[PDB]
RNA sequence: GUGCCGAAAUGUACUAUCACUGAUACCAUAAAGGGAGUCCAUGUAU
RNA sequence: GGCUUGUGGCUGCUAAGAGAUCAAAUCAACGCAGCUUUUUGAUUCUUCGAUGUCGGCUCUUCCUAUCCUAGUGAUGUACAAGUUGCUAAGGGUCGGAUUGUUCACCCGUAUUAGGGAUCGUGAGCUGGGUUUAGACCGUCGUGAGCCAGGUUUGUUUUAUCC
RNA sequence: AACGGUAUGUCGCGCAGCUACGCCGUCUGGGAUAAUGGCUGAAAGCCUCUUAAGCCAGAAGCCCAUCUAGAAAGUGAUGCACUACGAAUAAUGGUAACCCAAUGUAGAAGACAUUGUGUGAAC
């Protein structure tokens, strides 16, 4: 043909434009269609990406070559602290789209939520936001608005934010009433909370306003949203790399070595007519920091965090904590966690929003037996010889 | 063995039909025209052949 | 059911109908009727047979045509491999 | 400010009437843009729109003609062709238009005119097929077609309760007007009704 | 030339037409050859 | 590049027979009517105060007159492998030996189509070929010199403007 | 000697970082069509997928579902701040932001993100 040879297209056309996303967390596009009936049951939940190990699973697949054999599998580990419900929204259906019918708020609001409505907290003397404390306006107002949500709004979503949690300053010894208290940050830094909104897929609408009002001003944990064996979609922003050449960005073949003005380029931008560069053509620009979803990530185990028996499995009868000895770029993980199979989008420290998958697998890998023999807790700097500190003294008890 | 009587049901639909010789398309065994617009409802039709 | 040698299994309660093992394939083919048109079989007296009946001729005879088109074999000559579910009679339910 | 119940009408026939009276310098809402109905079978109307989807700018789609799938901006595009919209007089005139799928809560109160020579009875023959704009849009991907029908039901219930009250007013008005005919006279009643 | 863009009858009277189709000289292309599509129609037989 | 389509390519109408028998499963003469601008001609409208001329390398998009994949009908369709018609251009269509090659031709594999975009693409490359000045051979010419006859050495500039 | 310079030193091993020759995901059902196959059924007392009305089944194709960007589509929720039926048409001042100071979850410059009395930075 005219091309002179046939070879697939370089790079996907559906993930344009390849530019930066300014979202700090995974913005959810579309929630699963409500089954209707059943129970409302929350869907999405935020977890921070803590790090990564591998695990030695023992496999049970009938009619395959790995029947009753061991299989090493990489595992990301998202830390998930239990997050706090605050608000509640309706959404009326209209000809234009879904449009909102007012948010109700809780009785008080924690000052982690007040951070969101300032860029300069440290300057602010008044710090007056959410002054819904006045008794006459707030109490009367909610029962008016909660009536309007029964009338109009079909879809109902629950506003909720991450617990930054509280502490005592420096050398004051903690657990004492005279001491002034203050917000501890995350493993990142931040005290300002990640507010989301979470669709409740429970039938009747009216039924939802029992559940979403029962859940209001109470912390949610992970164990009553997801369950072990669930396929989960991980939504987040990927890993920023700045500007990039045409060769590395789109994965093209670089030119001959003999080229004047260098070879790290696509040679023909285009033909004479049309007299114009096309959108389709590969080109120099941003790489990474792209918002992405990824489908069908299994969760192997769910955590809790003095016994510290979470790291260890049924076998061995030795208790090992999940954090690898020495902790890189993160923190210990003294919270609920999720051993997700394989990769998850974004760097360490990033807020990933999890989500239940939109439609169901029929693949047998989806409904497999999980059974972990044994997990790595060696250090990542760089080659790790000892799984635990306990091993150390026994292996080399006398030092200096 | 097939059952002798029960050929006559199956051979009505499959075997005993007429066919165009431009469309190649299936028709009822007594038929003058071709239903399809392409080929201009060509009016030439043969019976379907008896291979063994 | 017109066949030779591989035998055809069926399953029905009232409004619906199922396939297995036609021309040797394990896959199940299922047909759903409209409302007010009863599919039923009984293998004592009828033996390798299905009964469709109902009020409206448009909805009844649709289903008998719709059942027929599930059984069509491809990449094989239908003159030799003649096999399926063919319409035998077109009688009344209770002739008075 | 006119309002037009555009159920029953033809797309181009209404648009030719509407686009002329925009240029005369008059504000004109139309409503029920989805129940405007084109000539042709459903097959034929879809194939016309599938040709329109192909028409994109090759260098890049973003500068390409936009393909509005909602009935209220399919009709607005058909009117925009018939006005000199690039000029200042046309752009002022085109801003005065309004289309709505389902008559909204603003314009329920207004009296709704129906321009008679653009009706599909008068312009198409009998025994030739026609399709709605809503039917076509849903096929072409409009996702709010289902939502509009729900809204119509709620409205047309409330429009029925208006008329049952409005009967009761006008019936006792006629019984009141029965009395006043005797008070004026026998010959005065003739002058009002017949004109002498 | 007279639906609207576009100034001027979607004029009156009378016949044809369903086709992802047709639409005004020079002019911006289409033929040989087919059709129980529809309307009009010539000669015969029953 | 344009107009034109002889030539090249592709397709109808008709059948005189091949096809055991039998014109129309599949081929198709002698004829007749078209389409195409992917061949080469014909012409001289544009460009001689210059649109950088062949092939390969690299990347994009488009057309269908479809080889494969999706779905269907015919048969000289038992099975399998085939021959053939229709809808379909979303995806796929390749590693090498010699040759400057386009093309061709062999070895090998996952079964295997052909085209367009200034014969896409030189301020993107390369410069093997073609086409200067050096030089050699062969035929021709008294000679200077000549030769779609062969061979070898031979400079590929500029973006910072819209 | 120790500990260093110079030959942009040579060889050996080498966290971090990036990277592939490594590792994980690519699930999944609609709607209307193109060819074509059917049902009922006239025209044509028979017969016909419609060459008529009506109905069904139907492509890796087209449009949805999913995923990427997104209100100069100059929009919206929440916090603070200054004049009328309906249906058919072979019918009824003081806040606030930004500078500035770090940091990195990131970066050519801008921007984005986080903190700014707190183990934030330096040790």
UniProtKB/TrEMBL annotation, chain A:
Q: Name one Pfam family in it.
A: Ribosomal_L3
Signal sequence: where?
none
A molecular function (GO) term: RNA binding
Q: Which GO terms describe its biological process?
A: translation
- A GO CC term assigned to this protein in UniProt: cytosolic large ribosomal subunit
Q: Which SUPFAM superfamilies match?
A: Translation proteins (SSF50447)
List the keywords (alphabetical).
Ribonucleoprotein, Ribosomal protein
Instruction: Tell me which family the UniProt entry assigns to this protein.
Output: Belongs to the universal ribosomal protein uL3 family.
**Protein name listed in UniProt:** 60S ribosomal protein L3
- Which species is the source of this protein? Trichomonas vaginalis (strain ATCC PRA-98 / G3)
For this protein's source organism, the top of the classification is: Eukaryota, Metamonada, Parabasalia, Trichomonadida, Trichomonadidae
From TrEMBL, chain B:
Q: Where in the cell is it found?
A: Cytoplasm; Nucleus
Top-level taxon of the source organism: Eukaryota
Q: How does it assemble?
A: Part of the 60S ribosomal subunit.
Sequence similarity: Belongs to the ubiquitin family. In the N-terminal section; belongs to the ubiquitin family.
Function, as annotated, reads: Component of the 60S subunit of the ribosome.
The protein depicted here goes by the name Ubiquitin, putative
Organism listed in the record: Trichomonas vaginalis (strain ATCC PRA-98 / G3)
Q: Which residues of the full protein are shown?
A: 114 to 165 of 166
From TrEMBL, chain C:
A Gene Ontology biological process noted in the UniProt record is: cytoplasmic translation
Q: Which UniProt keywords apply?
A: Ribonucleoprotein, Ribosomal protein, RNA-binding, rRNA-binding
Q: Output the superkingdom of the source species.
A: Eukaryota
UniProt GO cellular component terms: cytosolic large ribosomal subunit
* Single GO molecular function: rRNA binding
| Record-stated family | Belongs to the universal ribosomal protein uL6 family.
Q: What is this protein called?
A: Ribosomal protein L6, putative
Annotated source species: Trichomonas vaginalis (strain ATCC PRA-98 / G3)
According to the entry, what is the taxonomic lineage of the organism? Eukaryota, Metamonada, Parabasalia, Trichomonadida, Trichomonadidae
Q: Which residues of the full protein are shown?
A: 100 to 197 of 197
Automatic annotation (TrEMBL), chain D:
GO terms for MF: mRNA binding; structural constituent of ribosome
Intrachain disulfide bonds: 33-99
Q: Which UniProt keywords apply?
A: Ribonucleoprotein, Ribosomal protein
Say yes or no: keyword DNA repair present: no
Among its keywords, does the record have Disulfide bond? no
- Example GO biological process: negative regulation of translation
What are the record's GO terms for cellular component?
A: cytosolic large ribosomal subunit; ribosome
Q: Which Pfam families does the record associate with it?
A: Ribosomal_L13 (PF00572)
Tell me which SUPFAM superfamilies the record gives: Ribosomal protein L13 (SSF52161)
Per the record, the similarity remark reads: Belongs to the universal ribosomal protein uL13 family.
Q: NCBIfam families per the record?
A: L13_A_E
| Descriptive protein name | Ribosomal protein L13, putative
Question: Which species expresses this protein natively?
Answer: Trichomonas vaginalis (strain ATCC PRA-98 / G3)
Specify the taxonomic lineage.
Eukaryota, Metamonada, Parabasalia, Trichomonadida, Trichomonadidae
């Amino acid at each position: 043909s005219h091309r002179k040879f046939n070879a697939p297209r370089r790079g996907s056309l559906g993930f344009l434009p390849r530019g930066r996303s300014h979202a700090v967390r995974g913005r959810v596009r579309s929630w699963p269609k409500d089954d209707a009936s059943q129970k409302p049951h929350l869907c999405a939940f935020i977890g921070y990406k803590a790090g990564m190990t591998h695990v030695l699973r023992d496999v049970v697949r009938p009619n395959s070559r790995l029947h009753k054999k061991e299989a090493c599998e990489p595992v990301t580990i998202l830390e998930t602290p239990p997050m706090f419900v605050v608000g509640i929204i309706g959404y009326k259906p209209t000809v234009e789209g879904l449009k909102p019918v007012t948010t109700v708020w809780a009785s008080y609001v924690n000052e982690e939520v007040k951070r969101n409505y300032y860029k300069n907290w440290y300057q602010s003397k008044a710090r007056k936001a959410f002054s819904c404390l006045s008794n006459g306006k707030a109490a009367e107002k909610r029962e008016k608005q909660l009536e309007e949500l029964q009338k109009e709004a079909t879809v109902i979503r629950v506003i909720a934010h991450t617990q930054s949690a509280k502490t005592t300053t420096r050398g004051v010894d903690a657990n004492e009433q005279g001491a002034k208290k203050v917000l501890k940050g995350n493993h990142l830094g931040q005290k300002k909370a990640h507010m989301i909104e979470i669709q409740i897929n429970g039938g009747d609408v009216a039924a939802k306003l029992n559940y979403a009002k029962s859940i209001l001003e109470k912390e949610i944990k992970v164990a009553d949203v997801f369950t072990e064996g669930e396929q989960i979609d991980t939504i987040g922003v990927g890993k920023g790399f700045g500007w990039e050449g045409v060769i590395h960005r789109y994965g093209t073949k670089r030119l001959q070595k003999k080229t004047h003005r260098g070879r790290r380029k696509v040679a023909c931008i285009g033909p004479w007519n049309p007299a114009r560069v096309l959108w389709s053509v590969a080109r120099y620009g941003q790489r990474g920091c792209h918002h992405r979803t990824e489908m069908n990530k299994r969760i192997y185990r769910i955590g809790a965090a003095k016994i510290n028996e979470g790291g260890s499995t049924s076998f061995d009868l030795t208790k090992k904590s999940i954090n690898p000895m020495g902790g890189p770029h993160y923190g210990l993980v003294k919270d609920d966690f999720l051993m997700i199979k394989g990769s998850v989008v974004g760097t360490v420290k990033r807020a990933i929003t999890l989500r239940k998958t939109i439609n169901i697998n029929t693949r047998r890998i989806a409904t497999e037996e999980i059974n972990l023999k044994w997990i790595d807790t060696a250090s990542k700097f760089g080659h790790g010889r000892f799984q635990t500190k306990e091993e150390r003294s026994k292996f080399l008890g006398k030092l200096k | 063995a097939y059952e002798p009587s029960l050929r006559i049901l199956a051979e009505k639909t499959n075997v005993k039909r007429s066919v165009c010789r431009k469309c190649y398309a299936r028709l009822s065994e007594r038929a003058q025209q071709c239903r399809h617009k392409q080929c201009g409802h060509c009016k030439s039709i043969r019976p379907k052949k008896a291979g063994k | 059911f017109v066949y030779s040698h591989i035998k055809h299994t069926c399953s029905e309660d009232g409004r619906t109908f199922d396939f297995n093992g036609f021309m040797g394939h394990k896959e199940h083919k299922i047909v759903t009727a409209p409302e007010g048109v009863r599919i039923w079989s009984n293998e004592s007296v009828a033996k390798d047979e299905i009964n469709i009946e109902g009020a409206n001729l448009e909805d009844v005879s649709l289903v008998c045509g719709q059942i027929h088109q599930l059984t069509k074999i491809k990449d094989k000559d239908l003159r030799k491999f003649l096999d399926g579910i063919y319409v035998q009679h077109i009688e009344h339910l209770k002739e008075e | 400010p006119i309002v037009i119940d555009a159920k029953g009408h033809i797309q181009g026939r209404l648009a030719a009437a509407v686009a002329k009276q925009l240029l005369k310098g008059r504000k004109v809402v139309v409503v029920r843009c989805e129940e405007i109905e084109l000539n042709g079978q459903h097959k034929f109307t879809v194939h016309t729109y599938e040709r329109f989807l192909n028409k994109t700018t090759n260098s890049n789609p973003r500068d390409g003609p936009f393909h509005q799938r909602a009935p209220h901006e399919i009709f607005a595009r058909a009117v925009r062709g018939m006005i000199p919209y690039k000029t200042h007089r046309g752009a002022d005139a085109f801003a005065n238009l309004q289309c709505y799928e389902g008559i909204p809560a603003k314009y329920v109160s207004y009296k709704r005119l129906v321009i008679p020579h653009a009706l599909r009875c008068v312009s198409i023959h009998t025994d030739r097929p026609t399709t709605k704009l809503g039917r076509l849009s849903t096929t072409m991907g409009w996702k709010y077609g289902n939502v509009v029908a729900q809204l119509e039901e709620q409205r047309k219930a409330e429009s029925a309760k208006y008329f049952e009250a409005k009967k009761a007013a006008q019936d006792k008005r006629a019984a009141a007007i029965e009395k006043v005919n005797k008070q004026l006279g026998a010959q005065a009643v003739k002058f009002l009704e017949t004109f002498q």
